[PDB]
Structure 1
Amino acid sequence: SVTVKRIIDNTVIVPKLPANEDPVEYPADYFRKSKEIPLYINTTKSLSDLRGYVYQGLKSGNVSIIHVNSYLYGALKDIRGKLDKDWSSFGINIGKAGDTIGIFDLVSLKALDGVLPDGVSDASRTSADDKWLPLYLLGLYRVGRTQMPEYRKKLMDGLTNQCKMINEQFEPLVPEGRDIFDVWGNDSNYTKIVAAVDMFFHMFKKHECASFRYGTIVSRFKDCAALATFGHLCKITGMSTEDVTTWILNREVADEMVQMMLPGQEIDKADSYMPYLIDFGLSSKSPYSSVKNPAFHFWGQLTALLLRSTRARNARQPDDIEYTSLTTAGLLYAYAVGSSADLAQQFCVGDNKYTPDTTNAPPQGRDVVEWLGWFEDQNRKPTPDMMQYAKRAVMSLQGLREKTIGKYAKSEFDK
């Protein structure tokens, strides 16, 4: 299929189509350039000064993001953690056992000049500070990431945590739609702080100020869906990471799987930089995103939906993937795991079922080959029971948003 000719006049035609690139970029294949993560807190005025600027700037739609960065740096050197063991990652040697380290032991610089209001913008605010002002500012990042009315949901919830240890309350004013302090997420230095805070308190899960992670969390594995819809597929099929892989049955899902699994990235490592590859600015395009893994996403999510996932009803249905072959491949996989359950004596009182005592009736376990063979036999065209199976798994779902793999599934199987 390299050379295409046109029958009627026997001339050559050369089917090409527009380019398309932006490669992904991996964590490791970055620390091979720079070996530090730069945090441009440009300015160091005064913590007290800053405490004020914000406190007020916060009852107004024009608190400067260069200020909060500085208040946070200001309020957050509780260099307040002791490594019980070593800490490394991608070469970068964070610390060594017994040691004492603090959040910003991830590489601070400073830069460009003129900051906004001067001196002391209200001297009234006191050391109600490390207590709650930071936690609130960090919390806001999380509330910023969502567009939907669930936002003032996380806000209501995400404002009762300051009440803790100090009782506080609300500050802003305006609604959302990314505008009130949502630009915050776009400040390359704001994220580097929320990322370092989350990462720090992942290591010292036990700390008193560990509470901060409230809004600092959704930083972890940002733009890393696929590589975690994958662990959800494992959990829901009760299969092993290696057995799941074998059941991948389409070129792209396989291509995509390799992509995510390429070694030396510490994806499986306890506390590494990798989860934060996006907010530390380690990577601009994520190898682990549900957008560079569209087939693996539709596949793994459709499959989990058939297997009774609730999480999956509301996954979004990628465009420009091969829908029909992808779904059949997931029906097969769902039907395998679904019919041949999981059944097996585990405890006994001296007696126990020693188990290993028609054609066209489907395979006994969950081997990719036995099943692939039975499907060959069936005309590589799904039986009316595995089709009935799908129907029973999607009929009786409701509240289905447009363009979710759930609304996709019910339209395709319920009728």
Structure 2
Amino acid sequence: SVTVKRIIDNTVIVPKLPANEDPVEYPADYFRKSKEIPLYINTTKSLSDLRGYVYQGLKSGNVSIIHVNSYLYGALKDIRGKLDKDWSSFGINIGKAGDTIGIFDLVSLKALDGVLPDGVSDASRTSADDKWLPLYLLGLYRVGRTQMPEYRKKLMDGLTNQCKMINEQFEPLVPEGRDIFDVWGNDSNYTKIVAAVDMFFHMFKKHECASFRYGTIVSRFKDCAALATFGHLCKITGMSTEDVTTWILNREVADEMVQMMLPGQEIDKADSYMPYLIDFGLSSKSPYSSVKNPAFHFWGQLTALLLRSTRARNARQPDDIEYTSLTTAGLLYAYAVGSSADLAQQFCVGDNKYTPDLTTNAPPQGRDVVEWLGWFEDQNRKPTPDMMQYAKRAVMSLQGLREKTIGKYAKSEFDK
């Protein structure tokens, strides 16, 4: 369809629209450029003074982001954890046989020299270092990302978890709304610390300080939600990863899948840098994000919902996608799984159920794509009363779903 023409006067129109580049960048195609990830905190100001600096800063005022980072590195220099195996990611070989590494065995540099107050601060604070302060300092990042009234529920998390034979109270004054400690999310260094801490304790799960993960955990697979719904779609359909792939029926959902599965990205690998691609600054734009995989995210989450997913109901409904087309695809998929139970005898006493055995129009026995596409073709490509009912049965009795979710989308579509 290169040439379109106005039929009334035989003249040629050339239909075109505004371009939208915004390309994505992969973790691997960064280590092809630099073999290390810098962390700048040039502050050789004593640990005990940094301790006091931030304490009164947090109590009330302009807590410097330079200050908190400097403290954290010093407070977390605990060269803990014996490598049990080997630790290699993207060529970088940090961990050997039985080597004792730490956080900041990532890679680390020093920049600038300007600071706020004078050397010896206020010697009021005891240790309370490795004890609680970092858990607070790191815990605030997670609280910073939210904007909904969950901030108070996630600040209860902070305070209640910080009582590990420590018992204190609050610290800042004004409630959230992105302004106070949310400045930190935009610091290249602060996020890299958050990531290194998560990575490190994800390796050494058993470790007396792995409690630092609460709050440092939301950096893991940060804006890689599309990948997460692919995992989730598998566990709900109970199908293999490849068998789920074959049920993808829309061009733009295939596209996104190809993009999400591009090789050499270590996405399936145990302890890789991949899950921390954003906060380590390995990538400016995630190829695994929901905003770059909207067709897939909607399809998968819809399908999961009709299958009684509890989480899917609150997933966001993305704009600029082929709703009607994506939903019919989902229904069929959901209907196939949802009506064909796996159900086979597993254990016996020498007495097994032999399975030996409506030939015209009737839903196919198994859960095979080619079987179903042919059956649907027979229903001239339009969903039956039964499968339209199946969708209704599933969505009715869903209560209190927020707007712009796939939950409200699904109910409003199938509950008539």
Aligned to 2:404: 403
Deviation at residue 215 of structure 1 after TM alignment: 0.9
The CA distance in 2 between the partners of 1:370 and 1:237, in whole Å, is: 17
- Supply the distance in 1 between the matched residues of 2:36 and 2:376 (Cα, whole angstroms): 53
Q: Give CA deviations for 1:151-200 in whole Å, capped at 9, x if unaligned.
A: 11011122112111322321111111111211111111000000000000
Match of 1:88, SS state, is strand
Distance 1:223 1:21 in 2: 19
After superposition, give the CA deviation of every residue in 1:8-30 in whole Å (9 maximum; x if it has no partner): 11111111100101111000011
Aligned partner of 1:82 in structure 2 is 82
Mapped to 2, the partners of 1:301 and 1:94 lie a distance apart of: 38
1:111 to partner: Cα distance: 0.6
SS at match of 1:117: coil
Q: What secondary structure, in the 3-state scheme, does the structure 1 residue paired with 2:337 have?
A: helix
Identity %: 100
Say what the alpha-carbon RMSD is for the aligned residues. 0.8
1-side partners of 2:68 and 2:15: how far apart?
Answer: 54
Q: What SS does the aligned partner of 1:39 have? A: coil
Mapped partners of 2:185, 2:331: distance in 1:
39
Cα distance between partner residues in 2 of 1:208 and 1:314: 35
Please tell me whether residue 177 in structure 1 is matched to residue 177 in structure 2: yes
Per-residue deviation, 1:328: 0.1
Q: What CA distance in whole angstroms lies between the structure 2 residues aligned with 1:266 and 1:159?
A: 36
Stretch moving more, 176-185 or 351-360: 351-360
8 Å CA contact retained: 1:163, 1:169: no
- Equivalent-residue separation in structure 2 for 1:3 and 1:28 (angstroms): 41
Contact 1:61 1:180 in 2 (8 A): no
Q: Secondary structure at the match of 2:59?
A: coil
Structure 2: distance between partners of 1:10 and 1:193: 65
Q: Deviations over 1:234-292 (max 9, x none)?
A: 00001000000000000010000010000100000000000000000000100000010
1:400 Cα deviation from its structure 2 partner: 1.0
Given that 1:53 and 1:120 are in contact with CA atoms closer than 8 Å, whether structure 2 keeps it comes out as no
> Which SS does the other structure have where 1:40 is aligned?
coil
Confirm or deny that 1:339 pairs with 2:324: no
Deviation at residue 70 of structure 1 after TM alignment = 0.3
The CA deviation at 1:113 is 2.3
Contact 1:94/1:106, CA 8 A, preserved across alignment: yes
User: Match for residue 129 of structure 1?
Assistant: 129
C-alpha separation in 2, matches of 1:191 and 1:157? 20
Bigger mean CA offset, 311-320 vs 159-168: 159-168
Q: Could you report, residue by residue, the CA deviation over 1:46-99 in whole angstroms, capped at 9, with x for unpaired residues?
A: 111100011100111311110000000110011101111111011111121100
Distance (Å, rounded) in 2 between the aligned partners of 1:11 and 1:413: 45
Q: Distance in 1 between matches of 2:339 and 2:158?
A: 43
- Describe the superposition over 1:328-367 as per-residue Cα deviations: whole angstroms up to 9, x where unpaired: 0000000000011121101111111111324211100000
Shift of 1:299: 0.1
SS of match in other structure, 1:201? helix
Kindly state the Cα deviation for residue 399 of structure 1 after the two structures are TM-superposed.
Answer: 0.7
- TM-superposed CA distance for 1:114, in Å, is 1.1
Alignment TM-score, normalising by the size of structure 2: 0.99
Structure 1 contact 87–93 (Cα < 8 Å) conserved: yes
Partners of 1:104 and 1:259 lie apart in 2 by 32
Q: Cα distance, 1:44 vs. partner?
A: 1.9
Contact 1:198 1:217 in 2 (8 A): yes
Q: Which residue of 2 aligns with 1:25?
A: 25
Give the 3-state SS of the residue equivalent to 1:271 in structure 2.
coil
Could you tell me how far 1:120 is from its partner in structure 2?
2.2
In 2, Cα distance between equivalents of 1:359 and 1:266: 47
Q: Secondary structure, in 3 states, of the residue corresponding to 2:214? A: helix
SS in 1 for 2:295: helix
Secondary structure, in 3 states, of the residue corresponding to 1:94? strand
Cα distance in 2, alignment partners of residues 27 and 154 from structure 1: 30
Q: For 1:14 and 1:114, how far apart are their aligned partners in 2?
A: 58
Shift of 1:296: 0.2
CA distance in 1, matches of 2:111, 2:47: 18
| Higher alpha-carbon deviation: 279-288 or 114-123 | 114-123
The aligned residue for residue 204 of structure 2 is: 204
Return the alpha-carbon distance in structure 2 between the equivalents of residues 410 and 61 of structure 1: 47
Quote the Cα distance in structure 1 between the aligned partners of 2:210 and 2:253. 38
C-alpha distance in 1 between matches for 2:168 and 2:275? 32
Secondary structure in 1 matching 2:162: helix
1:302-351, CA deviations, whole angstroms, 9 ceiling, x for partnerless residues? 00000000100000000000000000000000000001112110111111
Aligned to 1:208, the other structure's residue is in SS state coil
SS at match of 2:319: coil
Question: Tell me, which stretches of 5 or more residues in structure 2 are unaligned?
Answer: none
Q: Distance in 1 between matches of 2:373 and 2:156?
A: 51
Q: 2:168, 2:107 → 1: CA distance?
A: 32
Instruction: Could you tell me which runs of 5 or more consecutive residues in structure 1 were left unpaired when the two chains were aligned.
Output: none
Range moving further from structure 2, 48-57 or 167-176: 167-176
Aligned twin of 2:167: 167
TM-score (norm 1): 0.99
Secondary structure of 1:35's aligned partner: coil
2: distance between equivalents of 1:213 and 1:168?
Answer: 20
1:315–1:404 CA contact under 8 A, matched in 2: yes
Q: Distance in 2 between matches of 1:165 and 1:333?
A: 52
| Higher mean C-alpha displacement, 389-398 vs 110-119 | 110-119
Return structure 1 stretches of 4+ with deviation > 6 angstroms. none
Per-residue CA shift, 1:207-234, capped at 9, x if unaligned? 1111111111111000000001000000
CA distance in 1, matches of 2:3, 2:226: 36
Deviation at 1:100, TM superposition (A): 1.0
The answer to whether the Cα contact below 8 Å between 1:162 and 1:169 also exists between their aligned partners in 2 is no
The corresponding residue for 1:248 is 248
The more displaced of 377-386 and 149-158 is 149-158
Q: 1:360 to 1:61 in 2, by over 3 A?
A: farther
Mean CA deviation greater in 167-176 or 184-193: 167-176
Following superposition, the deviation at residue 375 of structure 1 comes to 0.3
Displacement, 1:126?
A: 1.1
**Structure 1 residue 117, shift from structure 2 partner:** 1.1
- Match of 2:374, SS? helix
